[PDB]
């Protein structure tokens, strides 16, 4: 209570230095922590593939797509597409899709993570918890916290890494060392399986006891909670949308003084990407073995009391870890820094969403754009996004069995792959047109909604109570649909655009990867030695990542 109050007082009074901090904060945030711990408890190590593939995606971003964003001169994605394609229609629809994705993932998961952290600590149920978090974020933003966020990000990531290392040290000690994780985890099961409710009936051993292959990263391809054939490619697509299209990420990456400095920052970010496995997934399953009945229950009657949802609330593992396993005095430091990072991320998402909407939608709708009225529109947009995100919380807590990170991956894999296909085809093949790309992308969006809307209306339930969803619609994994949508939306944009030769070469000078360097005028559609050592460092870091992958795989 003292440490948390002092930390909040310091933060409010205040309101590869920024690059690494921003990259890690987006990579490993508060909602990211809680979701990673939860799915680590429910499923096992396998969720580590998410981080270990996002690492490779960050490396690919830094090595390939940052120079493309730099030579062209477009800091953001939508203006790069504006110069590449032309026409406010495609940029408008892409901004609409970005707004929807922000609402569906960023804000919703941030608020729900705050609710999970507060719910297993001082406070109340989800509604009061998110109301208090809204108050905290508002008082943060009013006092210009975002302005000093650039300086505070490095301090926050340093203290988060320090605290997470302390939690690493404490967790295996509370279990008995690394031997305890390989010894005790597979026997972690609740004592309550009676299911006094007559409708539910006696639960089979499949649900409450953990999966037998909860250790290995690579699950069964067909029948499994998280297949690896889906993992490797679907994560590539989703995280390629995440890292190579986010405006904030590219703005932070390009902020480096030189290209070699950008690559060094990417390598340091990779170092910080290899650690959150041991910091999140291991302690989540440690919290599961420590607290088997509380963390992962399967009987709905007890589950509503413990969780608030009938799924099982496997995602409350990390709040319990923080508020029990930590030393009594120091737990306030975690409960303070966790919420501070969450509030900073939420404020950044709020500002980015409002700026995007103002810059594209209301700008195209009303070309007058009175400054007072425009600011009023921005404030009303913030109000609207808060209301919609809070109204979406009951769907968020379900999240296909309570795994919060599964919800993020599902939503992104439903609506990102079309944008990824459009971007990759625009960057690779010159033939794609503005009308062709838009007409493919609208079809991809319809295809994605055709599987999202019925699934979310029907439900997911749990293993005990599956929803009355058709076998073909829900038996397909929530992430294999991203692989299907990649080669459906991209096929549509490649086929529609190929109907004619829409754009000559002069409009696409130094904007298409094929013509990386032309040294010619555009058509206006509107370290010599450090490099080898940096490449060697990247080779070493990537080899270490593969070593860990093969160790657990």
């Amino acid at each position: 209570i003292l440490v948390i109050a002092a930390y909040f007082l310091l933060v409010i009074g205040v309101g590869w230095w920024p690059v690494g901090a921003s990259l890690f904060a987006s990579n490993i945030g508060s909602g990211h922590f809680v979701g990673l711990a939860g799915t680590g408890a429910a499923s096992g190590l396998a969720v580590a593939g998410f981080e270990w593939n996002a690492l490779f995606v960050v490396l690919l971003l830094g090595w390939l797509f940052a120079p493309v964003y730099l030579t062209a001169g477009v800091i953001t994605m939508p203006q790069y597409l504006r110069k590449r394609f032309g026409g406010r229609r495609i940029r408008l629809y892409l901004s609409v899709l970005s707004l929807f994705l922000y609402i569906f993932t960023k804000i919703s998961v941030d608020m729900f993570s705050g609710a999970v952290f507060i719910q297993q600590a001082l406070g109340w149920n989800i509604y009061a918890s998110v109301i208090a978090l809204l108050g905290i974020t508002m008082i943060y933003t009013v006092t210009g916290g975002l302005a000093a966020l650039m300086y505070t990000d490095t301090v926050q990531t340093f203290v988060i890494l320090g605290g997470a290392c302390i939690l690493m040290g404490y967790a295996f000690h509370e279990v008995g060392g690394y031997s305890g994780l390989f010894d005790k985890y597979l026997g972690a099961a609740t004592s309550l399986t009676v299911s006094e409710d007559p409708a539910v009936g006696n639960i089979s051993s499949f649900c409450y006891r953990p999966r037998p292959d909860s250790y290995h990263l690579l699950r069964h391809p067909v029948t499994g909670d998280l297949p690896w054939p889906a993992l490797l490619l679907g994560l590539t697509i989703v995280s390629g949308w995440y890292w190579c299209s986010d405006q904030v990420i590219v703005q932070r990456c390009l902020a480096g003084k030189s290209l070699t400095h950008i690559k060094a920052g990417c390598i340091l970010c990779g170092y910080l990407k290899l650690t959150p496995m041991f910091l999140m997934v291991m302690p989540g399953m440690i919290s599961r073995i420590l607290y088997p009945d509380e963390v992962a229950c399967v009987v709905p009657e007890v589950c509503r009391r413990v969780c608030g949802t009938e799924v099982g609330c496997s995602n409350i593992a990390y709040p319990r870890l923080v508020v029990k396993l930590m030393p009594n005095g120091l737990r306030g430091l975690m409960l303070a820094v966790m919420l501070a990072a969450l509030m900073s991320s939420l404020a950044s998402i709020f500002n980015s969403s409002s700026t995007l909407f103002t810059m594209d939608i209301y700008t195209r709708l009303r070309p007058r754009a009175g400054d007072r009225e425009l600011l009023l529109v921005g404030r009303l947009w913030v109000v609207f996004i808060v209301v919609v995100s809070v109204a979406w919380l009951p769907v968020v807590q379900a999240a296909q069995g309570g795994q919060l990170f599964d919800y993020i991956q599902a939503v992104s894999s439903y609506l990102a792959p079309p944008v990824s296909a459009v971007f990759v085809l625009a960057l690779f093949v010159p033939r794609v047109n503005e009308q062709g790309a838009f007409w493919g992308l609208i079809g991809g969006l319809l295809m994605g909604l055709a599987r999202l809307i019925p699934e979310f209306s029907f439900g997911s339930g749990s293993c005990v109570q599956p929803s009355a969803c058709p076998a073909f619609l829900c038996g397909v994994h929530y992430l294999y649909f991203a692989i299907v949508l990649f080669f459906c939306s991209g096929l549509l944009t490649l086929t529609v655009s190929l109907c004619t030769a829409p754009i000559p070469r002069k409009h696409l000078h130094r904007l298409v990867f094929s013509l990386r360097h032309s040294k010619e005028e555009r058509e206006d559609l509107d370290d010599p030695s450090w490099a080898r050592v940096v490449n060697l460092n990247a080779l070493l870091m990537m080899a270490v990542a593969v070593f860990l992958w093969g160790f657990y795989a």
């Binding site: 080899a543 070593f547 992958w549 093969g550 160790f551």
Partner: peptide
């Protein structure tokens, strides 16, 4: 033991990187 699997993974993927290194050259 997992460490032999990790060593095999490193060897295989380093061989892959070395093979791909000739593409640019």
């Amino acid at each position: 033991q997992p460490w032999m699997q990790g060593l095999i993974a490193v060897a295989v993927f380093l061989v892959l990187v070395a093979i791909a290194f000739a593409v640019n050259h």
